[PDB]
Curated annotation (Swiss-Prot):
Coiled coil residues, start to end: none
Organism, scientific name: Legionella pneumophila subsp. pneumophila (strain Philadelphia 1 / ATCC 33152 / DSM 7513)
Homology family: Belongs to the DrrA family.
Annotated spans, Rab1 guanine nucleotide exchange factor: 4-184
Alphabetical UniProt keywords: ATP-binding, Guanine-nucleotide releasing factor, Host cytoplasmic vesicle, Host membrane, Lipid-binding, Membrane, Multifunctional enzyme, Nucleotide-binding, Nucleotidyltransferase, Secreted, Transferase, Virulence
Protein function: Virulence effector that plays a key role in hijacking the host vesicular trafficking by recruiting the small guanosine triphosphatase (GTPase) Rab1 to the cytosolic face of the Legionella-containing vacuole (LCVs). Acts as a GDP-GTP exchange factor (GEF) for the small GTPase Rab1 (RAB1A, RAB1B or RAB1C), thereby converting Rab1 to an active GTP-bound state, leading to the incorporation of Rab1 into LCVs. Also shows RabGDI displacement factor (GDF) activity; however, this probably represents a passive activity following the GEF activity.
Record protein name field: Multifunctional virulence effector protein DrrA
Location in the cell: Secreted; Host cytoplasmic vesicle membrane
Amino acid sequence: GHMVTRIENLENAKKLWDNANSMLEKGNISGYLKAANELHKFMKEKNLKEDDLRPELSDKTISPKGYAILQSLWGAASDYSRAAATLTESTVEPGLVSAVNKMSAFFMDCKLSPNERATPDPDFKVGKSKILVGIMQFIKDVADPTSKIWMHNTKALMNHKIAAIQKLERSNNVNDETLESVLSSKGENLSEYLSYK
């Protein structure tokens, strides 16, 4: 019955968590995010909460590295979500980015009780520009091909911003001002609207 079905869903949910944790532990940002999304979608679909899984993960561990990447993801996502809420538009992109924050916190909260504290390694830093590209890559890969941010195709505008951040990296001109310029843009100065194409 539905209780046995729930046990079986939690076994699969534990597998999905472990996949996310293993991506995390390798420092793969977009792919952690792919796996976090899959976990979170499954749990939502099966009416399962963090509290339902947490007793099943007593034999699992998020490492200090893991927590460090998680806190880095949170801070970059936080800033991006806020910086993307502009007078041009403030629904689509902030929502996409805020959802990244939610799915990643969900993954964390499945293991850690939210009443109790992350233990990040204060020396493990992932570069903010790499985190931001990872977020954009996740968004681009999961977006519907017809989805738009303002007048621009969402995938194409992600590719545009990813390129912008990589150009800043190559020229060693990454700072919070140059980054904000990319995060807050809706391609208002481009020569035409970006298409799915």
